[PDB]
Design a protein around this ligand. Structure first.
Ligand SMILES: OC[C@H]1O[C@@H](O[C@H]2[C@H](O)[C@@H](O)[C@@H](O)O[C@@H]2CO)[C@H](O)[C@@H](O)[C@H]1O
Ligand SMILES: OC[C@H]1O[C@@H](O[C@H]2[C@H](O)[C@@H](O)[C@@H](O)O[C@@H]2CO)[C@H](O)[C@@H](O)[C@H]1O
Ligand SMILES: OC[C@H]1O[C@@H](O[C@H]2[C@H](O)[C@@H](O)[C@@H](O)O[C@@H]2CO)[C@H](O)[C@@H](O)[C@H]1O
Ligand SMILES: OC[C@H]1O[C@@H](O[C@H]2[C@H](O)[C@@H](O)[C@@H](O)O[C@@H]2CO)[C@H](O)[C@@H](O)[C@H]1O
Ligand SMILES: OC[C@H]1O[C@@H](O[C@H]2[C@H](O)[C@@H](O)[C@@H](O)O[C@@H]2CO)[C@H](O)[C@@H](O)[C@H]1O
Ligand SMILES: OC[C@H]1O[C@@H](O[C@H]2[C@H](O)[C@@H](O)[C@@H](O)O[C@@H]2CO)[C@H](O)[C@@H](O)[C@H]1O
Ligand SMILES: OC[C@H]1O[C@@H](O[C@H]2[C@H](O)[C@@H](O)[C@@H](O)O[C@@H]2CO)[C@H](O)[C@@H](O)[C@H]1O
Ligand SMILES: OC[C@H]1O[C@@H](O[C@H]2[C@H](O)[C@@H](O)[C@@H](O)O[C@@H]2CO)[C@H](O)[C@@H](O)[C@H]1O
Ligand SMILES: OC[C@H]1O[C@@H](O[C@H]2[C@H](O)[C@@H](O)[C@@H](O)O[C@@H]2CO)[C@H](O)[C@@H](O)[C@H]1O
Lengths: 332, 332, 332
């Protein structure tokens, strides 16, 4: 037996009306495939003589180990996209432009414009609040070594006439000077001043000073000769006063120096000394003393003498002469 | 020949004891599948007559191109999760709340509380350190155009009596005034002062001033009439002094003006002029000069005259009279 | 019929020259596989009698649902890597080191070194610019409650002699004192001063003051007795002046107090009172008044008397005596 089977091309079977007997094999000549009869179905309705089911295969690949598009996408959706997020480098680049609380260097202007909760009161208020209670350094240190400039080191301005606080308030306890102004010996000379004050206020002193010294002056002024030359400073003074009219005024009636004691003092109201020796003084009652010969380009009105060293008046002289003239003419 | 084969249902083969001859075909009537004999195995132990090995298939899918769960997970593990990381927008939102070193606007309080390395000394110390050496602007510019307020523009306070530094130190070189206080002509008038100083310190002057002017006063004061009216300021003064007791004190012995030269000066100790003409002065030795008629409501003690223009004393008058009385009575 | 087929091992077929007839089955005894003849090809060139094409299988897996390495990699490439990006925690850790514009606490030094656009001029310049126009708090509040320190609360320094701005400028409008210095009654006593000024400048006053008061002094000084003891302050003064030579100088010619009116005043140039009663004064023309007995340790040069209360001169006395001597001797 060399057995051969009913056979033709797949497409010819496809339209054959031949019914294979149950288990009778038929052959597709162009595919090599067989199919077996069931006794009723046409060829195209028979299945192949061997399984075609993925689940019966051997050497299957690991389908279950492979990632699904859905599950991968869900996992990607939790991850941050490059474009919506700064790198470490761009983060640091941005942060290096900001000021550390530990400290840093400003190259531009720091403005304050408080919104003002209340901005407090005392040692806990202010837009800038500096507490040096636990440290030995300075608070605010401003300086310039520039040759010239357009602005002061520090400027304080108030714009409204009702303003009811000070520009600068110094409340000081300690053992040196609350406020100290040193104007160092000039090389190129200024025609100006350590401290300069002008007021146009007619209802208040330009400067007020109250002190309560046991044995010093409330204000102490010392002039020191700038030169070793004994008389170089001959036009200088410890205190100089001028009294002037208003530009285009008719003049002035202001006094130079006015001294009073509202409670009454027993001290000398004006005491002038040289080398610590009294030279001239006005006592608390208005009597004066002068150490040396003095001059008046005028007369002197005073009372009649009662002691030998009293200056005589014209009355006293005239009377003593008139007495002598009478007696001497003789008396009956 | 129409060949048919030993046949029955798969499940019936499954328990048949029939041994197919080597290569003899048997048919599963309900599956369509054949199996071929090996001459020993029961039907259920024969394999199908055609391969069932994934590796022999054609049109395989690209299994190797597909991603594995393991390898995807490893790759996801290097990526940043959305939730642990700021977006660019939230980054910028946070950074815009911080101050740029280039500059910016504070809306709240900046406090300093130095921890203090040493906080240095001189032109490199301070919690706030401003160096204007290479620029032409101002250092610290504080101002207010508010009508009223509860606090000063600037406040300096020291709390302990041992405190051994100044509240404010000005070390100045330059060509204008180190410190300048302008109190602008008021519209609504203050009863106060450009500069006001009080000290309760009995061992130190409230204010100390030293200068070394060639031809000016160490302190120069000018009063200017506030009005064009010649005598409007008739109660005004360039300098006014008061001398008062302590509240509930018995009084005071303090002097008004005390002038000394500890090294000895040849200048006039008190010089009073009007329109630049000497009117009254006290010389370095205590002699005074007065330009016009003067009055004492009292006597004047002085020495006996020796020149024609010297004031005479009662002694001198009495003696000259007593001489004339004698001579004239005549002498034996 | 029990049909058997041409058969041998796969490897033996592999080199057989037997040609199966068209559809004649041949069997591989070691694999179980059949192949069918085409009438020309050797065994090894026939295909199996049943399909081996993945596309004809049933129960296929969802290959299309699975993610490709390429497509996953493209998706991963858009995601940010953990290592190149800050977590929220490290972001906040960095940001907490920076200063909020809302406010914050500096623990280190804030330096300014302006690059200077121009740094402006007026109420819009300065490295630190504080505008309190809409608020009621203080501007700059510096204080210390430390026992001692190495630096001042505030320090202003200019290094070059040409410097042509002020260290401190106060431009004040308002109703209290522009600048106020309180030196609180000491418990441990300082030998120093509320305000201390030194100048080595020979071409400018150490301090300049101009005021235009209707009825006050430009400078007002009050000394108050520190004690209830009436004469405790007997060495004190409201104003004290000293006039000294330069260290290693030959001396000085400086004046003590110099008073002038450059425009001419009709006021009293020096007025001394006690309990508000005139005790001594120098009029605008140089005439003086003294309330009580006075003394000169010297002579007084003055003009010849013309009124009864005028002091007499030696000339006047000598002449009146010489007249009496003549008349009395009698006249022919
Ligand atoms: O910071 C600017 C404010 O200026 C205020 O106006 C006055 C100021 O009060 C006065 O002293 C002087 O400086 O002139 C100013 C106007 O030129 C304004 O009223 C206020 O609105 C601000 O512009
Ligand atoms: O006070 C404001 C102005 O002060 C001027 O200085 C003048 C001063 O006003 C004047 O009275 C006299 O003493 O000369 C002073 C110069 O030493 C400033 O020059 C000017 O800028 C204003 O700030
Ligand atoms: O510029 C004011 C200074 O004037 C000096 O007075 C000169 C005065 O100008 C001159 O006429 C002459 O009399 O010598 C005076 C000094 O002895 C003041 O001395 C000086 O202190 C300034 O006030
Ligand atoms: O910043 C507050 C500090 O105050 C210090 O106490 C004193 C201060 O020295 C004195 O001058 C006055 O201001 O009274 C204060 C107490 O009420 C404290 O000693 C210090 O602990 C701080 O609280
Ligand atoms: O010095 C601290 C206080 O100064 C007061 O001003 C007074 C001053 O004390 C007084 O002696 C007199 O001259 O009147 C001044 C007002 O012009 C302030 O009023 C007060 O707030 C304290 O700061
Ligand atoms: O408030 C102090 C001022 O007193 C003025 O003195 C007046 C004085 O009060 C009055 O009794 C009368 O004698 O006129 C005086 C002025 O001529 C001072 O003149 C003034 O400078 C202030 O000290
Ligand atoms: O901030 C330091 C600058 O100091 C300037 O030099 C002078 C200064 O002008 C003078 O007043 C005194 O302080 O001595 C200094 C030099 O020791 C320098 O010229 C400048 O280059 C800076 O170093
Ligand atoms: O002005 C700079 C210095 O002031 C000194 O204080 C001295 C002052 O100079 C002197 O003339 C006299 O009045 O004694 C003062 C002390 O009360 C400071 O001591 C010194 O640190 C310098 O800053
Ligand atoms: O240290 C300067 C103070 O001197 C006081 O003068 C004393 C003086 O030293 C003494 O010789 C004696 O005459 O008593 C004087 C006071 O009556 C000043 O009184 C004082 O104001 C300071 O200048």
């Amino acid at each position: 037996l060399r057995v051969q089977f009913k056979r033709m091309k797949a497409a010819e079977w496809a339209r054959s009306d031949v019914i294979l007997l149950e288990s009778e094999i038929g052959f597709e000549t162009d595919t090599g495939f067989a199919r077996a009869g069931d006794g009723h179905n046409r060829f195209s309705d028979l299945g192949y003589i061997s399984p075609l089911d993925y689940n019966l295969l051997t050497n299957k690949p690991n389908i279950d180990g492979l990632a699904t598009k859905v599950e991968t996408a869900q996992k990607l959706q939790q991850k941050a996209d490059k474009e919506t997020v700064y790198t470490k480098a761009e983060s640091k680049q941005e942060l290096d432009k900001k000021l550390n609380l530990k400290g840093g260097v400003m190259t531009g202007q720091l403005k304050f414009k408080p919104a003002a909760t209340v901005a407090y009161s005392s040692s806990t208020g202010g837009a800038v609040n500096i507490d040096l209670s636990s440290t030995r350094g300075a608070g605010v240190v401003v300086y310039s070594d520039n040759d010239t400039s357009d602005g002061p080191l520090m400027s304080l301005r108030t714009g409204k006439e009702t303003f009811n606080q000070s520009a600068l308030f110094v409340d000081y306890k300690g053992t040196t000077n609350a406020v100290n102004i040193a104007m160092r010996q000039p090389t190129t000379p200024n025609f100006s001043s350590a401290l300069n004050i002008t007021s146009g206020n007619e209802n208040g002193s330009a400067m007020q000073l109250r002190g309560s010294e046991k044995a010093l002056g409330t204000l102490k002024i010392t002039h020191e000769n700038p030169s070793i030359g004994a008389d170089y400073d001959k036009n200088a003074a410890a205190l100089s006063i001028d009294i002037v009219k208003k530009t285009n005024g008719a003049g002035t009636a202001a006094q130079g120096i006015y001294i009073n004691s509202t409670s009454g003092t027993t001290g000398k109201l004006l005491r002038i000394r040289n080398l610590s020796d009294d030279k001239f003084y006005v006592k608390s009652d208005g009597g004066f003393y002068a150490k040396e010969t003095s001059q008046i380009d005028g007369n002197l009105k005073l009372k009649d003498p009662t002691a030998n060293d009293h200056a005589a008046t014209k009355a006293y002289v005239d009377k003593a002469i008139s007495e002598l003239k009478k007696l001497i003419l003789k008396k009956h």
